[PDB]
Every structure is written in C-alpha cells, then in structure tokens.
C-alpha cells in the first residue's frame, strides 16, 4: 500500500497503488484506495480496507450533511479539523491493530494566488495533522522510497502531465523497492488510479494516460 501526492502550479495530483495483501499472500490486484469526497478535494487512506472505506464514506457523508444544513461548503481548516477528529476517535482500534492513516489533498478556492492554492495534509496515528509544504508527501508501507524518488524527481514538475509522470514513477520505484506494493500489470492490464484537482474541480484520470506513462517509464528503465 502506497499513496503519493505532489503539488504542481495550478493544481494538485494524487495517486495510489492497487495491491491488497493478507500477510504475505496477495488478496487483491486492482484495489482502489483514492476517493473523491467532494468537488475540490480528494482523500486516500492506507491500512485496513474495512476501516478505510468506512472513513471515506463517513467523511463524504459528513461534508455533504454540513453543506446541506448550512447552505455553504466548509472551509479547508474545518475539513482538516473534522478529519483530525475522525482519526483521533479511532485511536483505541488503531492500538488493537485497526490502523488507518489518511492523506488529504485539496484545492483552496479562497486563496489569493490560484497557482499556489494546492494543499497537502498528512495525519498521524494520534490525530495530529501537518500541512505539507515541501511539494510532495507519501503514505503507506513504501512511503520512504516514494518520498526519496519524489525528492530527486520534483525538479521536473512544471504542469499537470509532469506531476502525473513523477507520481507514476515514484509509485513504480516504491513497488520496485517494496514487496507489499503492486506495480503496473502488463498482463492483466491493471494500472494505478490517479485524481487531478484544479480550479475546475476534481476529476478522475483516464486509465489510458496512466497506461502510456507506465509503459514509457518501463521502456526507459529497460
């Protein structure tokens, strides 16, 4: 399990792997771990799937409920506070073993500079949150390898396509260096899913672009 997210001028990208493992045996091959909560942010949870899907659904439901009740969407700080409270409320279950660490990436429509409106937030096991400002952040088992790869590869990010390519390459490096992370599948045609958030909203990247990027990266590495 590895989820990466980096900031590019005018938006933010988010991607994750598609592998679920029960110990050392592979259980899933195309598991989806990146979800869209509402128009201008997406979340990704690494850990137990049973807690991850529940957290995603509950976060989306709470955001929609508040928006319907008050008539206006929550501010970014309010969303961060709600997610932090949700994470903190599961500390006992995390101690038992039901651990889920989410990653939040969104676009701030109430920012003076649209080019620097992208935000990346990481959460701790105890509920603490920190706003990422180095331009990238990764979570999961292979987070360290992906973070090092992004540290070296962030100099080539200029637009959305460059950021997507860097994210795919970081995921490939994490899968190469970690046995719990699943790389691109050229036999079954399974590729990581990505979400791009910009001023127009959050959209889902088509599988064709990710397939071409993965094929190009594999050819280059050969």
């Amino acid at each position: 399990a590895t989820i990466v997210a980096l900031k590019y001028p005018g938006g933010v990208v988010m991607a994750g792997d598609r592998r679920s493992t029960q110990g050392n045996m592979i259980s899933g091959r195309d598991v989806r771990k990146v979800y869209i909560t509402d128009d201008y942010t997406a979340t990704g949870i690494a850990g137990t799937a049973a807690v991850a899907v529940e957290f995603a659904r509950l976060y989306a439901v709470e955001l929609e409920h508040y928006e319907k009740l008050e008539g206006v969407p929550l501010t970014f700080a309010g969303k961060i506070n709600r997610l932090a409270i949700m994470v903190r409320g599961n500390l006992a279950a995390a101690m038992q073993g039901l651990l889920a660490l989410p990653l939040l990436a969104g676009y701030d429509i109430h920012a003076s500079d649209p080019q620097s409106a992208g935000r990346i937030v990481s959460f701790d096991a105890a509920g603490g949150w920190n706003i990422e400002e180095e331009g990238y952040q990764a979570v999961g088992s292979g987070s360290l390898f992906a973070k090092s790869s992004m540290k070296k590869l962030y100099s080539q990010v200029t637009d959305g396509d460059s950021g997507l390519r860097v994210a795919v390459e970081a995921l490939y490096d994490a899968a190469d260096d970690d046995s719990a992370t699943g790389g691109p599948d050229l036999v079954r045609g399974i590729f990581p899913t990505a979400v791009i958030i910009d001023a127009d909203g959050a959209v889902d990247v088509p599988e064709s672009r990710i397939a071409e990027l993965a094929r190009a990266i594999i050819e280059s590495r050969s």
Partner: protein, 215 residues
C-alpha cells in the same frame, strides 16, 4: 371536549397559514420547478433534502426550518445505513406526516406549516415526477401536476388548472408560474429546479442575471 379543542386548533392553524405568502411548485419536462415569494435572501423557503428530493414549505420560518433539518438528518442517516439509492421521497413524506400529526396531537400549539416533497427520476432512467402535500394535521396526498400552498390559494389554483400544458420548457413554466402567482422581478422571487439531467445532485438555484434572462 376533544371536538372543540380540535376545531379551535384547526382554525388557529388555518388562520396562521392564511396570512402567509403563496409558494407554487410544478413539474415540467425537465423535473420540478419551485417558485416562491421571498423578499429576503438570507431566508430560504426552498431547499434540497437529498440527491433527487426537494423541499418546499410556507408559514412560520422556524417550524419548517426545524422540519427541514430533521428531514435532512433522516435522509442522510438512511442513506448511510442501507444505500444512497434506497432513499425515496415517499419515506420523507410519510415521516413528515407522522411528525406533523404528533405535533398537532400532543403539543400546546399546532404547527402552522404546509410542506411539499418532490422527487425526480434518477439519471439515465425515465419516470414521472411525484409530488406529495402534507397539511398541518398530518394529512398526506398525492398531486399529479402542481402543488399550491399558502394564503388565498384559490385564484392561483384556478390559474394553474387552466392554461397549463405538460412537457413545457423551463422558460414557459417559469412564465406560467409567475403569471399564476400574480393572479415580480428578480428581487422578492425565489426560483429553484430539480434538474434530472444532472448525474448525481439534481438541485440547482437560479439567481442573478440568469434569472433576469429567464424572464
């Protein structure tokens, strides 16, 4: 004497709703159109309950505000319990009827409100819009084309019974609704629609220059 108390409560509720303004809800070729007489912008008499459900009411603001909040909580809890596609306007209308009946029976003052629940078809599916009307005592009814509530509704009811044609466009429906309400510019008018053409959420607010261009 229960009869005297019931009669006095019904008279009080009717007098309370009679002084309120008129809100008109009708179904056109693209969903359900809500038109209301609302001068202030902070106060909204038309809202959204779920993805394909709508809300409309007339009377004391706090009472139907509370009813709206309860309906939203019920809809969200039911959607989180079973599924998002397992919530229909019939359930909301039924729970609203039960709540209004309980208020009418076991409260000092009956609620001076009149609610309407409008549901539209899911995206990619063809089905006719359904409208439900709930009165102060908890009565429920099904109305095929239009629902008129609030104040002296007889002239507007006649004006919408006559010269009304289904499958009309948004502009024609808005013009007919405004004409029937008069019998009126951007200000003091609240317009909302239930656009079945939308993929997930069908509620939309028409305000500003778009409303002026519409009529």
């Amino acid at each position: 004497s229960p009869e005297q108390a019931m009669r006095e409560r019904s008279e009080l509720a009717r007098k309370g709703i009679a002084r309120a303004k008129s809100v008109v809800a009708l179904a056109y070729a693209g969903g359900v159109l809500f038109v209301a007489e609302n001068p202030s912008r902070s106060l909204q008499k038309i809202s959204e309950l779920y993805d394909r459900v709508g809300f409309a009411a007339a009377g004391k603001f706090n009472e139907f505000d509370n009813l709206r909040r309860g309906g939203i909580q019920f809809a969200d809890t039911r959607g989180y319990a079973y599924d998002r596609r397992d919530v229909t306007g019939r359930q909301l209308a039924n729970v609203y009827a039960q709540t209004l009946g309980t208020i009418f029976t076991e409260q000092a003052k009956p609620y001076e409100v009149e609610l309407c629940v409008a549901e539209v078809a899911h995206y990619g599916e063809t089905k006719r819009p359904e409208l439900y009307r709930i009165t102060y005592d908890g009565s429920i009814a099904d109305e095929p084309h239009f629902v008129v509530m609030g104040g002296t509704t007889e002239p507007i009811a006649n004006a919408l019974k006559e010269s009304y044609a289904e499958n009309a466009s948004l502009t024609d429906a808005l013009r007919i609704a405004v004409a029937a309400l008069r019998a009126l510019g951007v200000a003091s008018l609240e317009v909302a629609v239930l656009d079945a053409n939308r993929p997930r959420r069908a509620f939309r607010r028409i305000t500003g220059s778009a409303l002026q261009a519409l009529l």
